[PDB]
Please model this.
Amino acid sequence: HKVYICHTCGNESINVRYHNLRARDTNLCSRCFQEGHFGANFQSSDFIRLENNGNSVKKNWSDQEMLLLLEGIEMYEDQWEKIADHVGGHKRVEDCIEKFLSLPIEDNYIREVVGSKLMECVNDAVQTLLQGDDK
Amino acid sequence: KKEFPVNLTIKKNVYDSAQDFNALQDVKKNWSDQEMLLLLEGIEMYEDQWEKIADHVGGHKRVEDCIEKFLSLPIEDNYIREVVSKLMECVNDAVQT
Amino acid sequence: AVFDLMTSPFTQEEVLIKEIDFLKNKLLDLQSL
Amino acid sequence: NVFQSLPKETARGVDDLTRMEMALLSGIPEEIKWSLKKYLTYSNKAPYMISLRTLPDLLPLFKTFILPLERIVEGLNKSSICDSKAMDSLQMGLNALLILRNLAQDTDSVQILVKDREIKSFILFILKK
Amino acid sequence: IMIDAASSFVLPISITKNVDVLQRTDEILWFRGPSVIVNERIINSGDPHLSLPLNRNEKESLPGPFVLGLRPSAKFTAHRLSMLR
Amino acid sequence: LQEQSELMSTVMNNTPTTVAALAAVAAASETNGTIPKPRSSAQLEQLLYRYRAIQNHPKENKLEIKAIEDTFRNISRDQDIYETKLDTLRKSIDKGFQYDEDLLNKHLVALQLLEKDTDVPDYFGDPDTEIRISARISNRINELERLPANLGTYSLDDCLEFITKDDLSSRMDTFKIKALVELKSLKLLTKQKSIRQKLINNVASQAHHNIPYLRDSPFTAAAQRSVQIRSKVIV
Amino acid sequence: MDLFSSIISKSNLDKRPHELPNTNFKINNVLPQTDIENEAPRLGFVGANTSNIPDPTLPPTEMMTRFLHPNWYALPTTVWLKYGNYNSWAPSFNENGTVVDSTTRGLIWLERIIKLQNLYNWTPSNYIGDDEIENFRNGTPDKLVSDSLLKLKRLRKERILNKVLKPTTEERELYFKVKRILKEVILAKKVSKVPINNVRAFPVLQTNYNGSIPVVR
Ligand SMILES: [Zn+2]
Model:
């Protein structure tokens, strides 16, 4: 389990952080977000409520983890240790790569635009010929 | 089977573009968010009686228009993903030889 | 381009001498043809 | 403190040459395939490492694959190779025969092959057929 | 335009006697600007008080701000608490 | 030149009597190519209502009032025809049909999928067809990038949490995360293509040392054996 | 530096006198800001590229151009040699490291060669009227629905395969004509289930506000 130091103060976030999407490496507590202590450049639209708790049994991939994975891939372009800790550190490199490859992203558009027995019977006949000497 | 989820609730309507939700848009037929929440609220409880819903919304909406609205609510993704002579030619030659 | 560790009765210098003696001959064979 | 003074040269397991020499000496067939592939690569690329003058207990380790190939050559006048177990022995025998062919252009790995009075029986057998 | 300014400050004197109601560090946190009080988070996007249709000087004293905030009705909440157990 | 958007621009600029589109043959008829019978439900009709209600003051400078009133007559006539046909249509119903359930399911799901432009399964190379795929993805990107950033949910399960005037419910962002997973997954497409190339061109690039039924065939073993033949030493 | 505090959680029903841990404190009232939320930016502003990936509308979208699986490699076979015009006793070919023989390779070579209430009540779903549903309501109601949805699916394929984005005026007109019929049965027949499946959420706008700490240059 990591720790999330709240930006603009020194506090520790309890179980819910508010991730910023334009500095991309800051967080906030709930109380610093309710009152608007996050500087006049940001606008309270670009803060997603993320959690901090350990999720359920693995290979579930909640939308928070998918979002943080794609944030990491936009950040680093490589360096899957620096992706897997940014997911939360409770996932391995060898599973983040197995999940970024197994995503149907353009499969729906492919399905939009684009909508023998003889020798097996011969093999069964030969397997029947290799049973009794009389043939 | 794994499928990318068909997120209908985000998707803006193509044919009419006037039956969307009020956030995706940029008697009276206006359908504010309070009557919309009352409509989903009445459909969760009353289960298609169309007259307790028709005044649970608040009386400005006809039953015809409530059906007109109910025909354009998005469906769950996990329900779209839920509803959706060559034999004898060898034997006759294997019996002989 | 894969290296290796192994045991041998020769030192590491003598192995390099044998590598020179082999690669000069293969170099002459392939540059001649 | 005791886990800091490890010798760096042996902390990868065994070296690869003893790995190849033990893999053939066992009976696991896929590990024999791996060992013969690596012996073939080292015989092509650097034959002096597998010079028979240096490693004397290596030529019977190839005789034990090459000498049962005579039965296969005897039975090869009919469609003998039926399952996938005799064919694997055939391919191992041909690959070991190639390894001894590749080691025989050295003039110091050659006299050991000549003084053996049993490889010449195999050569005479193949030539008679 | 910088990002990494401090924008919170702490005075050295421990005045922690009557302060259990404010936001403590765990001292007292003293920011570089005030707070922002927001009445209701969810806008009610229709409602001709706000939508202003183009058809047809009048005042109206509405009860509270709770008209503009999507509150659920109590019969659903009792129905859901009945569905609880 | 989009006169049905020029009326909207004159309405939203709050100055429509000051110009009034200069209704002559040179201006009011150059944009029409009568008026073209507006398409929307009321978004192009309330504009005509306001346009007639503003043009009641001059009443003679604008000659195009008569065609607009003819279209009002057309709308009233079509409405009366539809009301008579709806009166007859509710009288033309059979007393018993007993409409089947498991086809009503399919018609509802099929209509809902055909509303919002997604592919419906039936249950009833070539760079021509490469651009026709790569022009549907730009559609979805430039449709998701026009959503408002202050998008939020209101599920039917916040009633069990008793949210006060300022309490910050914990299911407010179940649509804005989903509307960014799509928008950033449709921009990381030519990164997973470049990872899949490095995967396939290093799994299929061996193809004869890992797959067992290929490295045990006669011809593959013979080729791998025959590439390793060291050249003959003359003398 | 001129600092500020947090909001005191003193209730509106407290009525106590204002105590102060310091007399060098001052107290102020915070007026809540309230109005139509200032138009928030779009999602293209929130989460644009800060990377070096390309757009997925660039011409390299191939993924298989120079693949060449090793089932498709050229295998070494026999090399037939030609000496001259009158050399018919020479060793004719050469097989150093071949896979197959001369006989099988020769065989492989061989086998290849003006009212008022009738004017505000107005949709585009009633401009057409009905004109057919009266006639078809006398029999079954459901055949026209499937025969129209198949036409919608065919027209949607024909719009995908034509690089057109706006729907035509021929299927829009044909869309509402579907949605009318499915309405009327629900008006008339009261079919025994009419199933309910909703996502149990719907998107609403929420208030935005700038931060209160000023900018630092
Ligand atoms: Zn904080």
Summary: The radius of gyration of chain F is 33 Å. The beta strands of chain F are 151-152. Residues 175 and 181 of chain F are 10 Å apart (CA to CA).
